[model samples]
Target: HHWGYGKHNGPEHWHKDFPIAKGERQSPVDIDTHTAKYDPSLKPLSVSYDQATSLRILNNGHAFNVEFDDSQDKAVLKGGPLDGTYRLIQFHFHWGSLDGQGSEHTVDKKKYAAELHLVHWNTKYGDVGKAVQQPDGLAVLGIFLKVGSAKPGLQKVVDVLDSIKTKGKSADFTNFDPRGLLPESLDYWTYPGSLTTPPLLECVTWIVLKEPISVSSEQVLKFRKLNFNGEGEPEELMVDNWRPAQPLKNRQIKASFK
Candidate 1:
């Protein structure tokens, strides 16, 4: 009945309800390294995280995210492609049924095991509701996850999965520093795009990191334990929530480094 990654309600069917799904500046486009031009003007990204900012983790029927207390400036992302500071409200991951694919944005047509989207809103826009309506309302920092050694950062998130296995489930998740999940390199590709899913608001300033964080295949599989349906409904695995690559249109993808 809802937008899902099933045969009848998948990405292709999204445009029927959310007409903007076919709009220019749509997200998760293939990041072609060859064509992306370097822009020295882009500054290195600045991020500050307070360990206790994480409020709780929730399974919202679409994806699981660790929400944060955004009442203050505890966690903020600046520099890079962003004009001003953007508050980190929540972050979620998109994985696939297979270990070889799942990432929303690909590099030269290469899909990683998964992708992480750190959703932030521009402070100048009052609140997220007001921000979401403007063209520069959001800035989503996208990071790719590859198959490799176990990451200690992700283990903490993995441990909480059992607590919120079904949609609409949530549990306390404090003292979690999201910086632990980022790769060493801050180099990234910047572009103007919309959200990857429904409503697909064309208001995102996408800053996708060039480097990827390593997560074991086992960690990727753990997300499958989550269900798309609610507790009492028919159980269906929550996997491959990523939307397919949309058209690049007239936008230019810029790079922070060569």
Candidate 2:
């Protein structure tokens, strides 16, 4: 369905989608930096990962997200118009507790059913805490999830759902490669924005991938089965857990090819 086509699926009826949209500050930020009012000082530096990355799985099945320790080489963001370098720290997710949606970035104000954000810090400035405070000191990679063709890469994700089938339970995820989950296309859109979550800082450089990776309908349903709260008391199923779209605020979304 389209924006105002008909019924609830339409964008016109998303307020009914979740009560959080009413209060929760959403991400999947819009780009608008091309205007004269936009500052070139806020552009982000390009980065790359150099460490033999490792992930830690927390038993709290609220979401099967991992904390990446990049203390080694650290994920580096090295060249961009900004001309600075940054290091990878950690990344997590915000999801819904239902079967229809659980992501943060809405497309053209059309909410995708889930979203993922990969966070990194500008070592050119300092640590994560300090970097997030600067105007152009952070880089985030965002990906959206929809109900469509099942991507095999998603199997890595679906395979782990069983580990956290119950709350407060986790399994070790080893030899997990980050590249596997990325969509086939590296083409992306970029811009300068603030942190989607709390401690909102106007320092993040957002790289929102235009291409989306897919998991089977069953895979998504499994995620929806998860709970931010403890398992099986009175909590509803996890469905669409995403943030609402932020205002354009006159920022421009940049693009890059690989």
Candidate 3:
């Protein structure tokens, strides 16, 4: 069977197919703030965006992704523990069936309602697929989601999920700045980790923001209704599609703010 979040082929069984799932630097780790070392030298992140680069939003049988055109350096991420410019490729989310149980990474050992991952690739490697194999290849910006006031910017994304509910479904989504979804404060935690999903490459420089953005319970639930199975297949609701926190091993987790 293909890898999924089901009982038969879930995260626990991922190692059977993708051996790297059990790798030391695997992602979705618990951020122990008390143990995090403050690195004042860490530069504030420099994110440059171009709304025109937003291409479309899709259901990839795993998660809903807002894809971007990274052919040019129009939307790039620089500074903040980075060596060179990294191009913004796409963004997706991980969530659970209920509130307070979704986010991939937890702060102080507490889970948020959901988590947003903005995937970027190091320009030195040329493309995201290539970057996935190198130690310093990809940079994933993670933002935790909390239930509070409705986020009007994200509502644009929520409003279109209904049209692309099934796998392989997509719609034209342009002129949207993904930065609008971020919290005001850019302070974050940085660590070396792997992709939360298989092939589970150990190449991501995880930049998880300290401050969380707001989303209403209603809007958060809309994503749960998305079907993992595409049209003409057995329907499956996409929920709890997050990998558990892996061990910290000998790695250091650094904080951008004291």
Alpha-carbon lDDT, every model: 0.91, 0.58, 0.92
Better of 2 and 3 by lDDT: 3
lDDT of 3 by residue, 8-75 (tens): 99999999989988788988899999999999899999988753388999999889999999998988
**Candidate 1 accuracy as TM-score:** 0.98
RMSD in Å for candidate 3, one decimal?
Answer: 1.0
The 10-residue segment of model 3 with minimum total lDDT is: 46-55
Query: Which regions of candidate 1 are displaced past 4 Å?
Result: none
Q: TM-score for model 2?
A: 0.70
Best by lDDT: 3
The count of backbone overlaps in candidate 2 is: 32
- By TM-score rank, best first, the candidates go 1, 3, 2
lDDT of 1 by residue, 1-258 (tens): 688889999999998999988898898899889999999899999887753399999999879999998887789998998888789999999998898788999999999889999999999987999999999999999999999898999999998999899999999998898989999999999999998888899999999999999998788889878999999999899988888788898989999998
Q: Which stretches of candidate 2 lie over 4 Å from their true place?
A: 1-26, 30-52, 59-63, 77-82, 94-101, 165-170, 231-236
Query: What does candidate 3 score on TM?
Result: 0.98
Model 1 lDDT, residue 94, Cα:
95
